Amino acid sequence: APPIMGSSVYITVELAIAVLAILGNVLVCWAVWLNSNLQNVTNYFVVSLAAADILVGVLAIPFAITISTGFCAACHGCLFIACFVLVLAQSSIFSLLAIAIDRYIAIAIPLRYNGLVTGTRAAGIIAICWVLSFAIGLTPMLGWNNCGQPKEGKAHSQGCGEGQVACLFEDVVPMNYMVYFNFFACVLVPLLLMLGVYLRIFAAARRQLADLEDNWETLNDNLKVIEKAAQVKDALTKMRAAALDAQKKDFRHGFDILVGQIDDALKLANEGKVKEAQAAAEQLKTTRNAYIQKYLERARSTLQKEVHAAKSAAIIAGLFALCWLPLHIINCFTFFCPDCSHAPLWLMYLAIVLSHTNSVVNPFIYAYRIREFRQTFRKIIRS
Ligand SMILES: CC(C)CCC[C@@H](C)[C@H]1CC[C@H]2[C@@H]3CC=C4C[C@@H](O)CC[C@]4(C)[C@H]3CC[C@]12C
Ligand SMILES: CC(C)CCC[C@@H](C)[C@H]1CC[C@H]2[C@@H]3CC=C4C[C@@H](O)CC[C@]4(C)[C@H]3CC[C@]12C
Ligand SMILES: CC(C)CCC[C@@H](C)[C@H]1CC[C@H]2[C@@H]3CC=C4C[C@@H](O)CC[C@]4(C)[C@H]3CC[C@]12C
Ligand SMILES: CCn1c(=O)c2c(nc(/C=C\c3ccc(O)c(O)c3)n2C)n(CC)c1=O
Ligand SMILES: CCCCCCCC/C=C\CCCCCCCC(=O)O
Ligand SMILES: CCCCCCCC/C=C\CCCCCCCC(=O)O
Ligand code: NA
Extents of the domains making up the chain = 3-192+309-382, 210-298
Residues ≥6 apart with Cβ < 8 Å to 174 = 140, 144, 145, 146
- The CA-atom distances, in angstroms, between 22 and each of 26, 267, 362 are 6, 70, 12
Class of domain 3-192+309-382: mainly alpha
Residues in the ligand 3 pocket, defined by CB under 6 Å: 188, 329, 332-333, 336-337
Q: How many Cα atoms occupy the beta-carbon half-sphere of 368 within 13 Å?
A: 10
Beta bridge partners of 164: 74
The residue nearest atom 23 of ligand 3, judged by CA position, is 333
**Cβ of 341 less than 6 Å from ligand 6:** yes
One-letter amino acid at 367 equals: A
Hey, which residues does 166 pair with through a beta bridge? 72
Question: In angstroms, what is the span from residue 351 Cα to ligand 2's centroid?
Answer: 10
Distances in Å between the Cα of 286 and the Cα atoms of 273, 281, 293 are: 22, 10, 10
* Ligand in closest contact with the CA of 335: 3
Is domain 210-298 classified as CATH 3.20.10.10? no
What whole-number distance in Å separates Cα of residue 19 and Cα of residue 17? 5
C-alpha distance across the termini of the chain, in Å = 49
| Experimental technique used to determine this entry | X-ray
Question: Resolution to 1 decimal, in Å?
Answer: 2.8
C-alpha R_g of the chain: 30
Those residues whose beta carbon sits under 5 angstroms from the ion ligand 7 are 53, 92
**98-102 own/partner pairs: CB under 8 Å, 24+ apart:** 98/45, 98/122, 98/125, 98/126, 98/129, 99/42, 99/45, 99/46, 99/49, 99/313, 99/316, 99/317, 100/194, 100/197, 100/198, 100/201, 100/313, 100/314, 100/317, 101/197, 102/41, 102/42, 102/45
The residue whose CA is least distant from atom 7 of ligand 4 is 169
- The type of residue at 327 is L
CA–centroid distance, residue 241 to ligand 5 (Å)? 71
Distance of CA 177 to the CA centre of its chain: 26
Q: Which mutation among 352, 356, 359 tests ligand 4's pocket best, with the greatest number of atoms within 8 A of CB?
A: 352
Ligand (nearest to CA of 14): 5
Largest CA distance in the chain: 106
Contacts of residue 334, defined as CB under 8 A and 6 or more positions apart, other chains included, come to: 170, 175, 340, 342, 343
Q: How far apart are CA 182 and CA 216, in angstroms?
A: 51
| Residues in contact with ligand 4 (CB, 6 Å cut-off) | 64, 67-68, 82, 85, 169-170, 178, 327, 331, 348, 352, 355
183 burial level (CB within 10 Å; 0-12, 13-18, 19+): buried
Ligand nearest to the CA of 331: 4
**Phi (first) and psi of residue 11, to 5 degrees:** -65, -40
Instruction: Give the Å distances, CA to CA, from 151 to 72, 119, 155, 345.
Output: 12, 50, 6, 20
Contacts of 146 (CB under 8 A, 6+ apart): 75, 171, 172, 173, 174
- By the 8 A CB rule, do 31 and 381 touch? no
The neighbouring-strand residues paired with 72 are: 166
Task: Give which of 270, 214, 203, 208 is closest to 238, Cα–Cα.
Answer: 214
CA distance 66 to 119: 39
Cβ-based neighbours of 131, under 8 Å, separated by 6 or more: none
Q: How many CB atoms lie within 10 A of CB 5?
A: 8
CB 366 within 8 A of CB 374: yes
Q: Give the residue among 38, 196, 24, 47 at the shortest CA–CA distance from 129.
A: 47
Instruction: Phi first, then psi: give them for residue 232, nearest 5 degrees.
Output: -75, -30
Ligand 2 is surrounded, with C-beta below 6 A, by: 322, 325-326, 329-330, 333, 340-341, 343, 347
Helices (H) and strands (E) in the chain, counts: 19, 2
**Contacts for 306 with CB less than 8 Å, ≥ 6 apart:** 103, 106, 107, 205
**Ligand closest in space to the Cα of 56:** 7
Distance 329 CA to ligand 3 centre (A): 7
